[PDB]
């Protein structure tokens, strides 16, 4: 099998996406490679939603390899949703050619989440148990057909440029320092594991007694249960403005605390610079509440600090300090 490097483009530190090619001849799309879902879909000619109007739409009639499947697709995300119809076609991801791959063609993309997204579609990278009926995840096909060198992939999110990278089938040591640390997956659906505590200077501020978290490339922020998140916002000095936005005084950055996630026996600090979005002197919090869920989401805020490896052979997540 082979290793494939898939360069990722960063849009506003909030979404990281790459190019795939679908059909014969290839129709090009940008997709968010999403470790928090398992379905692969792109917009199509059958969608008249606003989001479909300002993105690339797949035309199955122009593809000689397209085979319709007939089955419906419906996906709800934390932000946004889609309906569509499943089919089969060849998708190429870097140097890996994935024939007869199930792919959703959108018919509805309601609301503006996807209207204002830079990517066209989503390529999910989680477990088959999270996939819709009749939908086989792309990476599972790649493993089952022996197209990749190893049953793992790795994600680097560049803090200081556009060198972000998804590596299929390998880890790249140029993206981290120190040692890789392995964390067992608890529930095989999302890339989920146990966090033992969240502390500031040895004092527990959140996740008292342990909690579940997922590692999700497709979530921009660090999301947690609302009461725990509110405790963190208070500790770091993030204050809600009249519009509901949690603002941070930029001049406090060198005088603010580090928030530490204890994960399988190793500490994962987030410095003020790591958790604070800094926009030309205007600063906001990278922590976000979720309504009633209690499952944490370690999104791009976290992954920028920790090079992330997703190992399907052994059901592990790997973390290392990013370069």
């Amino acid at each position: 099998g082979e290793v494939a490097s898939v360069p990722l483009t960063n849009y506003l530190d909030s979404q990281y996406f790459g190019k795939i090619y679908l059909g014969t001849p290839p129709q090009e799309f940008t997709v968010l490679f999403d470790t928090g879902s398992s379905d692969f879909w792109v917009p199509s000619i059958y969608c008249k939603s606003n989001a479909c109007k300002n993105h690339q739409r797949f035309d199955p009639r122009k593809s000689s390899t397209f085979q319709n499947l007939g089955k419906p697709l419906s996906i709800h995300y934390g932000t946004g949703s889609m309906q569509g119809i499943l089919g089969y076609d060849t998708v190429t991801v870097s140097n890996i050619v994935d024939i007869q791959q199930t792919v959703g063609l959108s018919t509805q993309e309601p609301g503006d989440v996807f209207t204002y997204a830079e990517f066209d579609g989503i390529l999910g990278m989680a477990y088959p148990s999270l996939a819709s009926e009749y939908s086989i995840p792309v990476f599972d096909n790649m493993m089952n057909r022996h197209l990749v060198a190893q049953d793992l992939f790795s994600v680097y999110m560049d803090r200081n440029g556009q060198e972000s990278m998804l590596t299929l089938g390998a880890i790249d040591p140029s993206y981290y320092t120190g040692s890789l640390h392995w964390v067992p997956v608890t529930v095989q659906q999302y890339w989920q594991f146990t966090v033992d505590s969240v502390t500031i200077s040895g004092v527990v501020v959140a996740c008292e007694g342990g909690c579940q978290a997922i590692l999700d490339t497709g979530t921009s922020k660090l999301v947690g249960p609302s009461s725990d998140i509110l405790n963190i916002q208070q500790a770091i000095g993030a204050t809600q403005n009249q519009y509901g936005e949690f603002d941070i005084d930029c001049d406090n950055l060198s005088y603010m605390p580090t928030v530490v996630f204890e994960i399988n026996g190793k500490m994962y600090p987030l410095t003020p610079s790591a958790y604070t979005s800094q926009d030309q002197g205007f600063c906001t919090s990278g922590f976000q509440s979720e309504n009633h869920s209690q499952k944490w989401i370690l999104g791009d805020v976290f992954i920028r600090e920790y090079y992330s490896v997703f190992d399907r052979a052994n059901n592990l997540v790997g973390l290392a300090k990013a370069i």
Binding site: L32, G78, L130, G218, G299
Partner: peptide, 6 residues
């Protein structure tokens, strides 16, 4: 932001 599946 986005928060990607239910």
């Amino acid at each position: 932001x986005v928060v990607x599946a239910x």
